[PDB]
Structures are given as structure tokens and as C-alpha cells.
């Protein structure tokens, strides 16, 4: 029998760090001690929230449209600013610009939050232009996008990813921008997404009882393949 050795408790070596508190790994925090009377769990009630289940993934929120650089007043510079709220006017030439600016994720309410949370990301971005005109107004508008472009200057969109918008019943055209960077993952706050330009293709037509100019709204969200990766510090403070 093992009576040739005096029974003793197990001896073990304690690794580096005496009471090192890991506040980075979730696998570490979830295992923390419980101040609960019996270390148990509670029964959650989604109904009171009108929901059938909790919200598990945040990416879905990043996939929700939000106005770009939204303002109370339309672009007062013929749309050459970041305001995603401008006017499509009959006067504007068949090639003049109705809106041009460099796009960044932070220009979007929902996205700007992730920008201040995660350090990197990847995936396609979707922009949806909604022109609110009357049933009589007609015309076309081509909106293109030069990925990672930085020179904020009007330029032919023949080689850019563009979408021609013909006014009808569904006046909310979109445009997708596939992930494009020299890396497998890009900074959530660094290099621009590209040059966004919406040029006039065909003057907005009208009649005696219809408006000679209409309002437009530009929204932005993440694609179904969107992802965010490293959480980083904050660059701004919300309220």
C-alpha cells in the first residue's frame, strides 16, 4: 500500500502575477466570483421590453441606416460639403454637382459609435440616396464613388462605382462599396472610405404645379459582410 510515503497535500507552483486582474479577456471576467446569496442566476423578462429575445450581436446595429453629417438646413454650398441633406435643383446644369465630399465612417451616427469603440473593421458599405420629389417631377442623377480617394474634386464618374437614379415611385436608390484596402482589416478611424459624388445627369423637370427643386437625404450602413475587430480607446465623448 502507499503507506511507504507520508500522506501530504498537493504542492503546486504559482505562476507570475500574485493578484493580477485581467480586464481584457471575457473568459476571465465571466469566471469572477459571485456576491449572490447562492451564486445563482435570475430569470430575465423580455416581454416587458416588447421583445421575444435579447440582442446578441452589435454588428446588426452597424447595419442600420443613419444620415451622413445630418444638418437642420440643406447644403448652402451647392452640396460641396459633408451635409447628407441637400437640394436637387432644376437650375443645376446636366453635369454640375449636387453633392461632393470625402466619406468617413464617423460621418454616420450609428457607425461613428463603432468608430469610437473598435479600432479596425472590414466589409462593404451601403449608401442610400432618397430624393423626395412630387409625382410630376422627373429626371436622372448619377452618384458615383471612388474608393479610398482623397482629393475632394469633381471628376468624371465613368470609371467610378456609380448608380444612375431615374425618378419614379421608389425614389431611394442605393450604392454598395465592397471592402477595399491594402489590408485584410482597416482602421475604423484613419483613411477615408473614398470620394462620394452625386452629379446631375438630366435636369429635374417640373410643371406649373410642381416644385422646381427637391430635397435629398443620404444614409449609410454596413453590408451583410460587415465586421469590426479590435476595440480601442475613445476619440470622442458622447452625451
Amino acid at each position: 500500500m502507499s503507506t511507504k510515503y507520508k500522506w501530504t497535500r498537493t504542492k503546486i507552483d504559482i505562476a507570475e502575477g500574485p493578484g493580477s486582474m485581467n480586464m481584457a479577456n471575457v473568459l476571465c471576467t465571466t469566471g469572477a466570483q459571485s456576491v449572490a446569496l447562492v451564486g445563482e442566476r435570475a430569470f430575465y423578462d423580455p416581454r416587458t421590453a416588447g421583445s421575444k429575445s435579447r440582442f446578441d450581436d452589435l454588428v446588426k446595429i452597424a447595419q442600420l441606416f443613419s444620415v451622413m453629417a445630418d444638418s437642420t438646413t440643406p447644403s448652402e454650398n451647392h452640396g460641396v460639403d459633408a451635409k447628407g441633406y441637400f437640394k436637387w435643383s432644376a437650375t443645376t446644369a446636366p453635369q454640375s454637382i449636387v453633392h461632393r465630399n470625402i466619406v468617413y465612417l464617423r460621418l454616420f451616427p450609428n457607425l461613428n459609435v463603432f468608430v469610437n469603440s473598435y479600432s479596425y473593421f472590414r466589409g462593404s458599405l451601403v449608401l442610400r440616396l432618397s430624393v423626395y420629389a412630387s409625382t410630376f417631377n422627373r429626371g436622372r442623377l448619377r452618384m458615383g464613388f471612388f474608393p479610398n480617394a482623397t482629393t475632394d474634386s469633381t471628376s468624371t464618374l465613368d470609371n467610378a462605382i456609380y448608380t444612375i437614379c431615374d425618378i419614379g415611385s421608389d425614389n431611394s436608390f442605393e450604392i454598395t462599396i465592397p471592402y477595399s484596402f491594402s489590408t485584410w482589416m482597416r482602421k475604423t478611424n484613419g483613411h477615408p472610405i473614398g470620394l462620394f459624388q452625386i452629379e446631375v445627369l438630366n435636369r429635374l423637370t417640373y410643371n406649373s404645379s410642381s416644385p422646381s427643386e427637391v430635397y435629398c437625404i443620404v444614409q449609410g450602413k454596413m453590408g451583410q459582410d460587415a465586421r469590426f475587430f479590435c476595440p480601442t480607446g475613445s476619440v470622442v465623448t458622447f452625451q
Binding site: 493578484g19 486582474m21 480586464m23 481584457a24 479577456n25 471575457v26 471576467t29 465571466t30 469572477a32 466570483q33 459571485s34 456576491v35 449572490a36 446569496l37 445563482e40 442566476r41 435570475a42 430575465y44 423578462d45 423580455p46 421590453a49 421583445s51 435579447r54 440582442f55 446578441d56 450581436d57 452589435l58 454588428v59 446595429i61 452597424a62 442600420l64 443613419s66 450609428n110 459609435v113 469603440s117 473598435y118 472590414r122 462593404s124 442610400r128 432618397s130 448608380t163 421608389d170 425614389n171 431611394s172 436608390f173 442605393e174 454598395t176 485584410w184 482589416m185 453590408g223 459582410d225 465586421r227 469590426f228 475587430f229 479590435c230 475613445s234 470622442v236 465623448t237 458622447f238 452625451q239
Partner: protein
């Protein structure tokens, strides 16, 4: 085949119900999902499973420290501001910076400031001087859901240090949550 709806032509007034994972395509393009890490960093459990600084308190006496715990409008925890209601475990990380003593720590969702005067059964864990602990407070709330914004969205934290001599110090506190249940996402926050 592909419909014109999935090619960009749609109507903003036909988006309800909320949550439409509609696919968008065009020639020479398709939603490509490529993963870099073995898991997601967007999942609520993972992201929030990582703590973030909250506040610091400098003690001199054996007084008590009562503070309304709330969600951050500052760190990566700000992603919570996108929601309206919360419920679940709460991980509190406390650092007791003192030469010689002990730190009593407790947590409750009870608003009454008298049920805390004693600390009988409010979870009085003990962190020896110069030590640090991570206590996970259960959802002992009297309200099924915690509006995520409230200056006391999270329950109050108590800290009554048991000092021995003239020794004094400071208690830095940071926190995270275990498995969080968020509901009814609200509009994105503004900046200061």
C-alpha cells in the same frame, strides 16, 4: 435570379418591420464574409465582457463610498447607449490602493440610502490592502429592466474601508458585465 429591388432600387417607406437583412449585388460583386479571428468581437457577451474604467475615490477616513453606477458615454462601453434596456450580471472591478487595511465592498439596486447604512447582506467582500478583486453582482433589481441611460442604470456600489492607523489612499474602480441582455435599440448618441 436577382430582382431590381436587390440591385439598389427600393423605397424607404417600405422598410418596416425593423431588421431586414436584404442582400445587395451588382455584376462582379457579392457579399463576401471573411473572418480573421476565431471569434466575433461584435457579440454583446464578448465586447462587454471586457471592463472599462469608471471612476476613482480618494479616502482618508473610514467613511463609506456610495456611487450610482451607470453605463459609460466614454469607453467602448458606449456601444450600450445604442440600447434602451438592460438586465443581467454585473462585473465590478475594484482596486484597493492602501498600505495597511481592508476594503468592504457591496452592491445593491435598492435606492434607499438606509438599507446600506449597515451592509448586513449587501455583499461585503473583503479586499486586503494593496489588493484588488472582481465581484459579480447579480441582477438583484426591483425593476425587471434597467433603462440603460439612468444616472443609476446600474445599481449603487458601496465601499467602507477598514483602516488601522493614519494610513490613507485611493480606490480606483472599473467595470464590465457578464452576459448582457439589451433590448429595443434607440437612436445613436450625439457628441459633446
Amino acid at each position: 435570379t436577382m430582382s431590381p429591388n436587390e440591385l439598389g432600387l427600393t423605397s424607404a417607406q417600405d422598410d418596416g418591420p425593423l431588421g431586414q437583412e436584404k442582400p445587395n449585388y451588382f455584376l462582379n460583386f457579392r457579399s463576401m464574409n471573411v473572418d480573421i479571428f476565431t471569434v466575433s468581437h461584435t457579440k454583446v457577451d464578448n465586447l462587454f465582457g471586457r471592463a472599462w474604467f469608471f471612476m476613482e475615490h480618494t479616502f482618508t477616513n473610514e467613511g463609506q463610498w456610495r456611487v450610482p453606477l451607470e453605463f459609460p458615454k466614454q469607453g467602448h462601453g458606449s456601444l450600450s447607449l445604442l440600447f434602451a434596456y438592460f438586465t443581467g450580471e454585473l462585473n465590478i472591478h475594484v482596486l484597493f490602493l492602501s498600505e495597511r487595511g481592508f476594503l468592504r465592498v457591496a452592491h445593491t439596486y435598492d435606492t434607499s440610502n438606509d438599507r446600506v447604512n449597515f451592509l448586513s447582506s449587501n455583499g461585503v467582500i473583503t479586499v486586503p490592502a494593496g489588493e484588488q478583486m472582481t465581484l459579480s453582482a447579480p441582477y438583484y433589481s426591483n425593476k425587471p429592466l434597467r433603462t440603460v441611460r439612468d444616472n443609476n442604470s446600474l445599481g449603487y456600489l458601496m465601499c467602507k474601508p477598514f483602516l488601522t492607523g493614519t494610513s490613507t489612499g485611493k480606490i480606483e474602480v472599473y467595470l464590465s458585465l457578464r452576459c448582457p441582455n439589451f433590448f429595443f435599440p434607440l437612436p445613436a448618441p450625439k457628441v459633446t
